Structure formats: structure tokens, C-alpha cells
Symmetry: C3
Subunit: 262 residues, 3 copies
Amino acid sequence: SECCELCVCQKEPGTFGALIAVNTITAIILVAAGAYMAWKTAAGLGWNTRPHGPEGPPEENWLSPGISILCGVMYAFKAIDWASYNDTGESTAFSLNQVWYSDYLITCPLLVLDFCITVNLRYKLVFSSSIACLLAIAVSTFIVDAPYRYYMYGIGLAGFICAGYALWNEINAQREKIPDSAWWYLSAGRLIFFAGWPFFPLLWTLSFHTSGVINEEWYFILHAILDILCKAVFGFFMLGFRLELEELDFKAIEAEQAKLEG
Amino acid sequence: SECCELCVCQKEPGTFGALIAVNTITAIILVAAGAYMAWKTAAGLGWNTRPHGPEGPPEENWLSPGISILCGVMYAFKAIDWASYNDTGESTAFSLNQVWYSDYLITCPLLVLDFCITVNLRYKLVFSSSIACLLAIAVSTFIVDAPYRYYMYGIGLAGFICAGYALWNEINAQREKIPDSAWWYLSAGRLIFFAGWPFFPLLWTLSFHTSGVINEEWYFILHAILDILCKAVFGFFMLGFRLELEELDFKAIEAEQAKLEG
Amino acid sequence: SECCELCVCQKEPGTFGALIAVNTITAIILVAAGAYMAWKTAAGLGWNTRPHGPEGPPEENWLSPGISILCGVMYAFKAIDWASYNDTGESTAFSLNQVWYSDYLITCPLLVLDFCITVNLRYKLVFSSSIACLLAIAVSTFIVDAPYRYYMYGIGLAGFICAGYALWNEINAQREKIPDSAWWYLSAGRLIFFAGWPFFPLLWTLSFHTSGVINEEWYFILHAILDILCKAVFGFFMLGFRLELEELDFKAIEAEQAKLEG
Ligand SMILES: *C/C=C(C)/C=C/C=C(C)/C=C/C1=C(C)CCCC1(C)C
Ligand SMILES: *C/C=C(C)/C=C/C=C(C)/C=C/C1=C(C)CCCC1(C)C
Ligand SMILES: *C/C=C(C)/C=C/C=C(C)/C=C/C1=C(C)CCCC1(C)C
Ligand SMILES: [K+]
Ligand SMILES: [K+]
Ligand SMILES: [K+]
Ligand SMILES: [K+]
Ligand SMILES: [K+]
Ligand SMILES: [K+]
Ligand SMILES: [K+]
Ligand SMILES: [K+]
Ligand SMILES: [K+]
Ligand SMILES: [K+]
Ligand SMILES: [K+]
Ligand SMILES: [K+]
Ligand SMILES: [K+]
Ligand SMILES: [K+]
Ligand SMILES: [K+]
């Protein structure tokens, strides 16, 4: 039928509790992580919350909490949607669970931008737009029928590997500048970027529409954990990196000022 | 049926004259207001149209006329759409009247940005993106079915109140800088922002889909007046503010130059 | 029926080879042109590929290759879509051939921006957003029914003529600055802009939905050539302009430095 054997549209009303629970929990996690990040950025500069200043926190210091909070709002909307599936058995009109990877568009162009701004990686906009385009091909690979979904997957994967290589090069060409104390958080966010991301593309090969190992319910459940790790946990490592940099900057400024007085 | 009792889809062909008229009138108003604003910005700097310069009017001086003109084009498209409902009785393919608050997305992210640029309010992009996201929840609250539209409304209203509080704080933390002559126009645009906006959210509670006091025809008619007051009249007050600032700046420059010669 | 007499939906499975071929060829052309442009921008500054520097190529030097490559990816997706029409006889779920001029949105706001950045034309964002809005009216004129498609066409054409006039003025008010060596490429990209663009609007008058001279198959075939000329060939002239400017800049810097040493 319209709903494939392994879809959430074949599940009966009353059997969606797991999905609502997972999505509410992730909404809370993402929103609260983003709120901690927001508090940390507002409260102060470095690890010891040094008073910001007249201009306040930079506007890019809000990109990171921003994504986490927005993804949490998205997940709350998804859980509201899943609750309609539990009752009416037929979703909402505004379902963020209908189009797969449609929310990942926004989130990704915002995260790659974050990384590229914080680490001062070059071609910030280039990278961010490339990822938006590769995550538009991702949506397509879920909608487009069999033979052509694999052709589209090929294009998307080629570009993903190309952009990944270029990104790797950029981070490794900024390693010299990045202090060793701040590199821990960077390498952790990179690890999240090079392992965690390829996971999204490989889970495709075992998905409900491709193979059929993971049914749509469980695919959705797994993409929630992956979002906690991207979005939320990526931002906590990037927040850490930022704070380390800002504490080291405070230290450097204070030392420069000591030498200025002396 | 698909069309609720109090909808424009239940109205017979030939009974849409009022809607076409209102929407054409508002199109004219918004476009002409934006054109006056455009002329004023191009012609000169302050109230006495002081010759601009080599670079010309700043690109942000076009955000304000821009929105008004675009909303007027939107309303012209809406009136064309309403004319098809008057004749064919079944709308156009490209109807800006189908999805409610879908046009408000663009207009709002552009207006909050305007305010934040002109008054130099901090977190410009943050505020503008927050409003875009809260006006995406607004569209949802019109499409999503009963129980879940109120859950979504709750999220949207929470964020609206949060962003409103934050905005209020920002404007009041910039009051010291803003000259008293320019504050008149600011307080008027703020009044339009804190009263006029909450009106949009409260009319929801009495709308065709929520309660049923205001049928979709009249809801549409009221949202046209509200757009004249937001968009058009908001920009005339903001244009006024800008011009006041620019005239005071011209005065300050001329005084500084007199002291430079002396 | 839903498909008009002169549409690609009336063509039988197996008769789409021409469309696939044209769209694959254009995909290759656009991608390869954009890749040459990308190589040229990365490799060096001017015509003689002068080593760039620490910061590398400006982020706007990627807007031009970018569009060409993205339009090539779009056309590859279109050819994949056309192959489904050749086999299944009913398109893909993600068809870039469904909505007419929907891809032109992105491409156009990116190209006008390019021109305005490279030639330092004023009102860059204004122009780019105007074109995005006029190319949203373009999509409408393909979907909206008879009487109202001509009303929308009128609005779109009025704005197109207005923006065209304003653009002409801007380029002619920057002619004095632009060196004569670089003007060749500029006038060629302008020629592509003032002739080539009006072609898009005039082909509308003879299209499958308006008149019926050009059926949708051949309209699609012609819009592919027009994209090679816009996108691809526009960027090769703009790449040329950029390179000329950069070689002249290198020359000027080297002369200034000779005088600095002397
Ligand atoms: C926070 C959101 C994330 C990390 C989403 C990432 C999405 C991708 C890395 C998409 C990957 C792809 C697919 C699974 C579909 C098409 C092929 C790829 C590789 C672009
Ligand atoms: C110029 C356009 C304007 C002023 C539109 C504003 C729209 C809102 C303030 C939306 C308000 C909300 C709803 C009516 C729906 C969801 C809840 C709110 C408060 C976000
Ligand atoms: C690279 C993409 C290009 C050059 C697309 C350009 C599209 C236009 C110039 C659209 C023109 C118009 C229509 C054919 C429909 C509505 C009326 C116009 C003039 C805006
Ligand atoms: K901070
Ligand atoms: K950042
Ligand atoms: K998300
Ligand atoms: K989804
Ligand atoms: K994050
Ligand atoms: K002005
Ligand atoms: K402004
Ligand atoms: K509007
Ligand atoms: K509407
Ligand atoms: K306005
Ligand atoms: K270059
Ligand atoms: K450029
Ligand atoms: K294209
Ligand atoms: K098309
Ligand atoms: K190009």
C-alpha cells in the first residue's frame, strides 16, 4: 500500500507510546542542553564566567545553543505528532515526521556554520551550503523510488566524501593555531563529525526503505539518539572549546596588561 | 467537510467582492507606503533630504520599504486569488490565502531584523530567527487538529512571551543612547510591537478554527488591517525614527566641523 | 485532463530519451564549467595563477563556481527524474521538473548577488531579493490558471523591467571604475543579462501553458540551453572579469612596491 510493510503508518492506534516517550525525552534533553549552553554563553566569557562586556556575547555564541533548542522544539513537535498517531492513528497536518531528513537541513547548515566560525575554518559558507544541498539529496533518497534513489544516493555520498575530505583538511590546517588545551574539545567534536556523521549515511543502507533491517519506528528512535549526539553533545564539546579559548584569551589579555603596566 | 462551517470555501462564487476589495486596497496602501519610504530613503538622509553620498543609502535602509512593498505584492496576489474564488469558486494554484501565517514568516523575520538594526538592538539575528520559528508554529496551529493545536500554541506563546520580554529589555537598555527626539517614533513602533503583536496571538483564540467568533472571511479582513499597522505603519514610524536620527547626525557633524574649523 | 495536451505527462514511457540526454549533457557541462571555475579560483589569483595567500580565495569567489555546480546537480537530478518517466512513465517523488522555475529561484538570487559583489554594484541584497521575488511570481504564472496568470505576469514583468532598469543604471554608474580590459567580460556578462534574461520572459508568451507553440518537452530542452548560457557561460565571463581584475591588481601592487623600494 502507500505505507510500506515496515512503516509507522502500519502501526495501530495505541502502539506509539515508545515513540512519544523517546521524542519527548530527546526534546527535553536538547532544549535543556541548549539552555545550559545559552546560560553559559550569557553568564560569562570563559570557564570562570568572566563578565562579558557592553556588546555582550557574540551573535555566533547563540548559533550553538540555538540549534540544540530548535531541535528540541522540533522534537517536541514530533512528539505531539506521535501522540496524534497514538490516538487518531493518522498523524497531524504539520508533521515533522512525514518528510525524512527535512529538519536535518536546517540543523546541519547551522552546525557546520558553527564549527567553521568557532574554529575559524575557511570557506564557512561554502561548507554550510554544501551540507544543505547534500541533505536535500538525503530527503530525496527517502522519497524517490528504487532505482533512482541509489543514483541520488551516489551523488550525495560523493559530495559527502568530498566535503568531508575538505573539512578534514581545513581542521588539520588550523590545528597549529588551536591551542592544545582547546584541541581536546575540538578533536571530540571532530570525532563526533567524522564517525557520527558517516553513521547517518550507513544507517540508510539498512533502513526501512532500502533494505528493511530497521523499521521506521526504530529508525526514528535511533535518529533521536543520533541527534542527541550531533546537535546537543556536539554543542557541548564546541561550547567547551569556546570556553577554553575564552579563558585562555582572558589569561593572555591579563598577561599582556601586566606587561603593559610593567 | 474539508471546509469548516466558518470558512471561505463555503462561500459561493460571487460573494467574494469584499475580500478582493479589502486586499486590493491594502495592497495599494502597503506598496505606496513602501514606495514613499523608498523615495524618502533614496532622496536624502534626514528630514530635509540631505544629499546622500557616493555609497548612497545603506542596504538596510531598504529593508523597511522592502517589507511594505513585498507585503503589498503579496496582498495583490491574494486579491488575484480572491478574484478566482469570486469567479471559479475554487482559488488559484498559487494561493497565499491557503496556508495561514505563511507570508507572516518572511515579513516578521524581516521586521524584527529592521527594528534590531535601526535601534542597534543586540542579538539581531537571534531575535529574527526566534520570530521566524514562532511564526512557523503559528502556521501549524492553524493546520494541526484540535488537541495538538493547543499544545503547539502553548509552545509558541511561551516563546513569544520570552522573546517579547527579551526584546523589551533590549529596547529599554538602548533607551539611554536613543535621543529624546527620536524616542517618540521608537516608542510608537514599540507600542505597535507590544500591543499590535499580542493582538495577532489573541485573535487566534476567537478564530474560525479555535472558537468560531470570527469566520475566515472576517479573520482575513482583520489581518489585512493588522498588516497595514504592522508592516506599513510600523515602517512609517521606523522611517521617522531613522530620519530623526539622520537629521540629528547631520547636525552633530556640522557642529563638529564648525569646531574643527574653529 | 490534469496533463495539458502539450505536456510531458502525455508522452508514453520510452519516449523520453531526448530529455534525459539533454539534461545529462547540461549537467555535465554545468558541473564541469563550475569545476573549472573552482579550480581557477583555488589555483590562483589572476590569469597567471598567482599564489593566493594565507586566507586563500575569498568566499565570494565560490559563489560563481557554486551556482554552476549546483545547477549541474539539479540537472542530474532532473535527468534521473526523466529516466523514471522513460521507464515507469510517471516521474519521481522528488522531481525538479514538476514545479517550473522553482530551481531558478535559488540560481537567480545567487547570480545577481555574484554580479553585484564582483562589480561592486550597490544595493546587492536589494537586487538579489527582488529577483527572488520576481522568480516566485514566475513559478506562479505556470501554476495559476488563465485569467490570473496574466495578471501575475504583469506584476512580475513590471518588477523585472524596474529591476532591469535599476541594474543597468548601476553597471553604467560603475563603468568609470571598471578598467577597459575588464569591461569586455563585464559587457559580455551584461549582454547575457539584458538579452538572455528577457528571453526567459518572452518564451513564456509562446509556452505550452500560455500559447502552445513550444510543448513542455521542447520548452524544457530550451531552458537547458538557456541555463548553460546563464549559470555556466555567465560565470565564465564573470570568472574572466574577476581574473582580469586580479591580474591588474597584482600588477598595480607590484608597481606600487617598486615605487616603495625606490
Ligand atoms: C544533526 C544532523 C545531522 C548530523 C544529519 C546529517 C545527515 C547526513 C550526514 C546525511 C547523509 C546522507 C544520507 C543518509 C542521504 C543521502 C546521502 C548522504 C551521505 C548525504
Ligand atoms: C507583520 C506580521 C506579524 C506582526 C505577524 C505576527 C504573528 C504572530 C505574532 C504570531 C503569533 C502567534 C500565533 C497567533 C500562533 C502561534 C502563537 C503565536 C503567539 C506565536
Ligand atoms: C539562471 C536562471 C535564470 C536566468 C532565470 C530567470 C527567470 C526569469 C528572468 C523570469 C522571468 C519571468 C517569467 C518568465 C515569469 C514571470 C515574469 C518574469 C519576467 C519575472
Ligand atoms: K561566552
Ligand atoms: K559559533
Ligand atoms: K532535528
Ligand atoms: K523525520
Ligand atoms: K548544538
Ligand atoms: K535615508
Ligand atoms: K534598517
Ligand atoms: K504579508
Ligand atoms: K493567509
Ligand atoms: K515596513
Ligand atoms: K581567484
Ligand atoms: K563573486
Ligand atoms: K537550475
Ligand atoms: K522545471
Ligand atoms: K555561474
